[PDB]
Amino acid sequence: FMNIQLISPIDAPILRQWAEIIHRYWPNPSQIRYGTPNVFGSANLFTPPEVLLLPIDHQPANVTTPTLDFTNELTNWRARVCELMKNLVDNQRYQPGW
Amino acid sequence: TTDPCAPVKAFMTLANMMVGFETIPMDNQIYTQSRRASAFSTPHTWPRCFMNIQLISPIDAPILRQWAEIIHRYWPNPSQIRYGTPNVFGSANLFTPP
Amino acid sequence: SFRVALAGWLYNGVVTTVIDDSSYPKDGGSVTSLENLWDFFILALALPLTTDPCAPVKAFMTLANMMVGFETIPMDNQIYTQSRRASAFSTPHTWPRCFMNIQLISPIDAPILRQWAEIIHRYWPNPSQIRYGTPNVFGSANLFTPP
Amino acid sequence: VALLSGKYPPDLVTNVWYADAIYPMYADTEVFSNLQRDVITCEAVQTLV
Amino acid sequence: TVTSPYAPSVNRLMPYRISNAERQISQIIRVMNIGNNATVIQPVLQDIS
């Protein structure tokens, strides 16, 4: 899993694609800068004052009338999972079984 | 319908169905490929993609390009017909010739 | 309310007439709502008849509040934000520098707010004065004012 | 299920929605009350030492 | 948004503001109480939920 090249691209193609997807399209952190340190203190430790950390990325909304879009990281994740499953279901070693 | 925005509302009606299947560039963030098709009722809201047909890429999104071409080509053409008589009744119509 | 508006002009020095909060848009408001648009219209036509030191600031800042998320204006400090209620602008020390100087409002990012600010700075009613009573035989109880 | 199913109100604006939802919670005093408890704890530890 | 008066005032006593070392010490003590119990930390997650 650490070194993707160990997985053979000709014997484990689908699992190789899964590992590549994990490495490329996994969520990445961000920060949001909460609170005020003037009146209240900075009770956070191991981190700079006045900040969170998030498991996923953050892009502030530019408009106040939200409407649907698919230009999203957690949507790309789902799309990649769906494409991986499609590749799984159309495979010469697995297609004729259905 | 006599609404002067039916040509753009038809294109937006098709575009809103396949959101994420094919995407086209659409002006501001507020009026987007997912914005309700009935909100395009004014000339200022006509997308530049619908104005200049070349903006729709015919590789990833051929269906939208073909639909825009069909709208631009096969939309009905206005005409006229003579009516009434001005000899005794007179012509009460205005902004148009009698 | 209309008659007390005229009555308070004489007694500005001890009582100042302002507009109640309920007359403003209910929840800050937005220009996407017809009710909020009509509330702003009523506010705009009702504000000038008040003996409030800062009426134009409230008048401009109401539209600035409603138009959050559609067009922005430069702010002087990070403590405040465009989306702050116009009822809090009751003191001269809270006049935004963008409202003071129109040149800071960028026309590309605020075509409507710049026009509203220009309208307020141009067509706000000018104060005046009128001669009343008789000073020679009745004297005058006028202070901070010629008798 | 939460990821695959989720919808907004038919037409909402975030500024008004949050100006309505957050206002009730910003009228209490618990946050200001906990700081005095923190002071007393930090005083008592040093007094004990 | 909140509002504050702008006028001469009668003096008031509000000792709420504290430093950062006291906050850090209190946070350390709160982490201490939690330990590995896991029955103390469930209610707070419920509360934020």
Added chain:
Amino acid sequence: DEADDATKKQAKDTEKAKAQVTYSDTGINNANELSRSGNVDNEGGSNQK
């Protein structure tokens, strides 16, 4: 209290239960305004007795 009393009496003057002109609950924050009462004497003390 006297501001609220004047607000009440304005409604009686105007014949309607509710009031349009209100001397209370206006938007302006006046937490510093003071009126003369019997709580304080002439020298800055308190008239408890």
Added chain:
Amino acid sequence: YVRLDRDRVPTMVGVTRQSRDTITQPALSLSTTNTTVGVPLALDARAIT
């Protein structure tokens, strides 16, 4: 009255008892405790319009 000249907008009104050639305890009159110039009064924008 001033329209937009913020540099000359009135903000306080007070009454003093002492002569100008003396220094004593500063006893501000109660008229200075209002955020505005005087007592706040509320109207109805709907009624005015």
Added chain:
Amino acid sequence: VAVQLFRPLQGLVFDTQLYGFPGTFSQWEQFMKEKLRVLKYEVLRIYPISTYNHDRVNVFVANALVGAFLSNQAFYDLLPLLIVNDTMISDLLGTGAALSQFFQSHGEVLEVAAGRKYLQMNNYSNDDDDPPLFAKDLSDYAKAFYSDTYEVLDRFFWTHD
């Protein structure tokens, strides 16, 4: 196996699947040539060259416009901001005209995402003699915080992790 992107083409911040590049150098070259030729005519239409010839161009706005058009995402808003009035950071601060993925406003410092410098084709197989891409072929390798003064940047990074 790979190409290097210069000034106008910088700013591709999304995944390569969204762009849908052909994957072959000749086909990719023709496709990009056609796309830029299409975009140039719109840029001409809004800004004629007879009038605007020596006016300076916001490189941030140019990169954002190119990336938005190639990603089919709301390019028309950035076009009024193409010309520079006073300064790049000053003109780009507080606008909110484009997506927050391209550039963002944090007080008086401007944070601009860094686009891909290298782009690899299908022939890239991590070979022994393949060019080193230096991890610049990914969408989120680095972020740039632009400001006029270094002291303001230090003050900003005091709180930022």
